[PDB]
Amino acid sequence: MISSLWIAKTGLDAQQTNMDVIANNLANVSTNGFKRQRAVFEDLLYQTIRQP
Amino acid sequence: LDAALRFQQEALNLRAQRQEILAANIANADTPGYQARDIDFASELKKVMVRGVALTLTSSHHIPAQADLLYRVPDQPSLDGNTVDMDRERTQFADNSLKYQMGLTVLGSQLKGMMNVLQ
Amino acid sequence: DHAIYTAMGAASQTLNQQAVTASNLANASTPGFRAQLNALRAVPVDGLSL
Amino acid sequence: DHAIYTAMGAASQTLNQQAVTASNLANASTPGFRAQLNALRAVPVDGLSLATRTLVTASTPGADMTPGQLDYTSRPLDVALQQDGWLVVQAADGAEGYTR
Amino acid sequence: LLNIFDIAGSALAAQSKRLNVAASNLANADSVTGPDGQPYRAKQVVFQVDAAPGQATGGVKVASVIESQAPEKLVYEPGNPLADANGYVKMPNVDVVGEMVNTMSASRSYQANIEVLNTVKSMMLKTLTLGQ
Amino acid sequence: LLNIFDIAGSALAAQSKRLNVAASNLANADSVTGPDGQPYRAKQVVFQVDAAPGQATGGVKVASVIESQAPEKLVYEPGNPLADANGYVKMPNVDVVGEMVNTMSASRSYQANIEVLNTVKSMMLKTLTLGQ
Amino acid sequence: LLNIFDIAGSALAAQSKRLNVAASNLANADSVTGPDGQPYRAKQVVFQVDAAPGQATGGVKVASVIESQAPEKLVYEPGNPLADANGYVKMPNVDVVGEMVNTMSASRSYQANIEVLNTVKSMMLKTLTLGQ
Amino acid sequence: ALLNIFDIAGSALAAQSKRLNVAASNLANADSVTGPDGQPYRAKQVVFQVDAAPGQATGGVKVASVIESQAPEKLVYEPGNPLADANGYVKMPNVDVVGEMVNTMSASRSYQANIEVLNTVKSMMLKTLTLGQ
């Protein structure tokens, strides 16, 4: 499978994980002492093909 | 003599029988519990090549007379019953048709050689 | 070519779940009604290979 | 007949552009990420007569140094640089990488 | 009838009859009554192999169309006739998505057998030209 | 089987098994229990290159369909049986978007192999008319 | 080389070169830079009649590929290098519809000349059986 | 219509066939995570040379020394699947799918051309036999 499909797939999964974080964060209003949780993402190692 | 043609004769006939078997497999693609079949071409062809008695020949009006389905191992169980895998059947059918054409060409070329020797 | 049937199964079964909830749901304001919860079962097709 | 190769090149290289965009595009909401802008280069094939073919090689000239837009989090040690600024960071191998 | 022609054509006939049954079901779902006045019972075909004496395989026969034995889902309309005591009409139990998948699967099998026939026709016509 | 028919047919069969795994996983997403009473463990197919002896290359073998070892995401229902202490139902660990992407990828690989088979088949018919 | 084969073969060469130029245009449309850094200037071929001394007719020669000197439509990206004062990238001026029609017509003309060649070859091989 | 043109065109047929079989292997084994010993599959290419190097003049093609393509071996990231190393990266063979499509396309076309050349030469030679009579 080509790289474009799986790159967009990992983008979709990252957005899904962010939404999971947000939904948990919103369910836990009125939970005493709860601390809001923030998702932090990162890029992956760049496959160089032709050096400049 | 003139049994040099026997080998490709039997090979072509066996290819045709295998074609009939594979067409039966395709036709029964969706009947429940069909349990698809096949033959082993090399073994059948060897067996036919390696191997018939003419009856009593007394006064006339004497009436001279005369007269292995292997199971393909399935992948992807169904529990709708059947075990015909369409992709395997299609590739086998296409290959069989191609090899039947080859055998037909070879037998025709042998016949052409024999007929060309005679003029 | 049999994948479709598995998918068909799911779709068909999902429709039945819908009906359950509908029967579960139209019965609001029915005195003493007991809601009928539903579930989906994986049914493996254990056969010869793969 | 060799025209197909040139066309193939384009098709293949266009997929590469797609790939870049995808990686460029999945990385929204990645902190301080710099979009990797991309271009297509014509490549003439200078030869012995009738210079008619050119290839379509894909390339990434660099990154887009346009400051992304700021999110106010009030966290005491979350930092935003001004335009054209970089925080210096000891990379994995050990050398001053620059990040936003 | 040539043997492989018989096999593939029998498959074509069986697939056509299966598609016809599926269309009849998909059309007569949502039908209150029959002619004499009874539930419409979803119909199904039964597939069997052919040419029993000899070779034990070859082609498909569709003998004995039957009526499905699903439990005849009821609805409540105790003003409409055809409803028994505890007014309940019979309302055919056709599984629409199953019948849609039946239609597509039958069409695909039809295509497969059609094209097999065409291939065998080409093979035989080149068989006639053996030598000459 | 001729060589390329084998290679491409193996690709087709492997892609079909991958698609069946994807369809099964996608269909059993949100399925509380199996027969024995166990989480439905999501499935994966591993592609090895076929032809280990000789030229080391050609064709694909996908034997031993295995289980994806992600952690069986849980939900809290201590009224449902199948929940342990700290009531937690087991709730299959199927990544639905991964399965949709996987389905599209499998379909595209399937179609590519169909196309290569078509081209090569035209080539072979031309081959047999070699001379005659 | 017999005269008519030369005429039709020159037609084939000219059509192939025309199709190659069209493909290069259609492929490098939207290409920011050349090797040294300059716009890709859209390319055209020049068709002229061959056999200049003698009969004034016969064959087509595509000597002297030229450039289409239309004013090279601009875009505005004043952070991109290759942008002058008044940042204006140069952006090759290839009209895709024209190039697609060129490819279609070139393929059809190619076919016509190929099939003229076949006709003529049969004509001559039949001439060799003149009498005997 | 010499007999040493059968050798040339037959060698061309064999070389085209082997190239096409390799390209089919490449296209089939795209997204083949592992090798039998356990290794990412390396997409391969075939090397075409002129046959009968010394002296000769020109004649035939040889497909000796099938080699291994040096594309950068694209990665994916699935740190739930085994066969992913530290910084979980499934190694994912490096197949340029459209390039391989076109390779098969052109391989079929060249094979067909050489088959035809064989037939044409045989017709030339059989009409050579009818020299005199």
mmCIF file of C-alpha atoms in Angstrom, chain G residues 26-89:
data_model
loop_
_atom_site.group_PDB
_atom_site.id
_atom_site.type_symbol
_atom_site.label_atom_id
_atom_site.label_comp_id
_atom_site.label_asym_id
_atom_site.label_seq_id
_atom_site.Cartn_x
_atom_site.Cartn_y
_atom_site.Cartn_z
ATOM 1 C CA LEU G 26 0.828 17.826 -20.155
ATOM 2 C CA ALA G 27 3.256 16.392 -17.628
ATOM 3 C CA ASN G 28 5.199 19.534 -16.704
ATOM 4 C CA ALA G 29 2.174 21.793 -16.537
ATOM 5 C CA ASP G 30 2.430 23.381 -13.093
ATOM 6 C CA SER G 31 6.223 23.170 -12.876
ATOM 7 C CA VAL G 32 7.732 26.108 -11.020
ATOM 8 C CA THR G 33 11.319 25.789 -12.176
ATOM 9 C CA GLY G 34 13.639 24.443 -14.814
ATOM 10 C CA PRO G 35 17.131 23.187 -14.031
ATOM 11 C CA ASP G 36 18.919 26.523 -13.761
ATOM 12 C CA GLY G 37 15.769 28.277 -12.553
ATOM 13 C CA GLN G 38 13.497 29.656 -15.261
ATOM 14 C CA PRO G 39 9.926 28.931 -16.325
ATOM 15 C CA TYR G 40 9.222 25.808 -18.274
ATOM 16 C CA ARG G 41 8.364 27.297 -21.653
ATOM 17 C CA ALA G 42 5.593 25.323 -23.348
ATOM 18 C CA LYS G 43 6.845 23.347 -26.333
ATOM 19 C CA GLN G 44 5.383 22.797 -29.797
ATOM 20 C CA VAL G 45 6.645 21.045 -32.912
ATOM 21 C CA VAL G 46 6.879 22.356 -36.464
ATOM 22 C CA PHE G 47 5.534 20.172 -39.263
ATOM 23 C CA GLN G 48 6.944 20.809 -42.734
ATOM 24 C CA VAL G 49 6.693 18.876 -45.982
ATOM 25 C CA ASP G 50 9.675 16.742 -46.953
ATOM 26 C CA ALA G 51 11.438 16.032 -50.267
ATOM 27 C CA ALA G 52 12.024 19.711 -50.986
ATOM 28 C CA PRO G 53 13.812 19.137 -54.337
ATOM 29 C CA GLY G 54 11.469 17.008 -56.440
ATOM 30 C CA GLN G 55 7.676 16.910 -56.888
ATOM 31 C CA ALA G 56 7.143 19.364 -53.992
ATOM 32 C CA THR G 57 5.192 16.660 -52.102
ATOM 33 C CA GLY G 58 5.884 13.627 -49.966
ATOM 34 C CA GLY G 59 6.366 12.872 -46.298
ATOM 35 C CA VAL G 60 6.401 15.106 -43.256
ATOM 36 C CA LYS G 61 9.506 16.302 -41.416
ATOM 37 C CA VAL G 62 9.351 17.810 -37.946
ATOM 38 C CA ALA G 63 12.718 19.529 -37.910
ATOM 39 C CA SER G 64 13.205 22.521 -35.610
ATOM 40 C CA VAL G 65 11.124 22.046 -32.474
ATOM 41 C CA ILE G 66 10.231 25.543 -31.264
ATOM 42 C CA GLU G 67 8.671 27.182 -28.217
ATOM 43 C CA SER G 68 5.201 28.679 -27.843
ATOM 44 C CA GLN G 69 6.006 32.301 -27.033
ATOM 45 C CA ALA G 70 2.741 33.192 -25.294
ATOM 46 C CA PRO G 71 3.370 35.563 -22.374
ATOM 47 C CA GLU G 72 3.872 32.828 -19.759
ATOM 48 C CA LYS G 73 1.044 33.317 -17.246
ATOM 49 C CA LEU G 74 2.200 34.525 -13.820
ATOM 50 C CA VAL G 75 1.335 33.884 -10.176
ATOM 51 C CA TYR G 76 2.122 35.780 -6.982
ATOM 52 C CA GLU G 77 4.267 34.182 -4.259
ATOM 53 C CA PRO G 78 6.582 36.868 -2.952
ATOM 54 C CA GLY G 79 8.489 34.611 -0.597
ATOM 55 C CA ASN G 80 9.404 32.068 -3.184
ATOM 56 C CA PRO G 81 12.803 32.505 -4.795
ATOM 57 C CA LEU G 82 12.502 32.839 -8.572
ATOM 58 C CA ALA G 83 10.193 35.785 -7.835
ATOM 59 C CA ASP G 84 11.478 39.106 -9.134
ATOM 60 C CA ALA G 85 10.606 42.521 -7.818
ATOM 61 C CA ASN G 86 6.839 42.460 -7.842
ATOM 62 C CA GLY G 87 7.076 38.867 -6.695
ATOM 63 C CA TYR G 88 5.669 36.972 -9.666
ATOM 64 C CA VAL G 89 6.565 33.333 -10.289
#
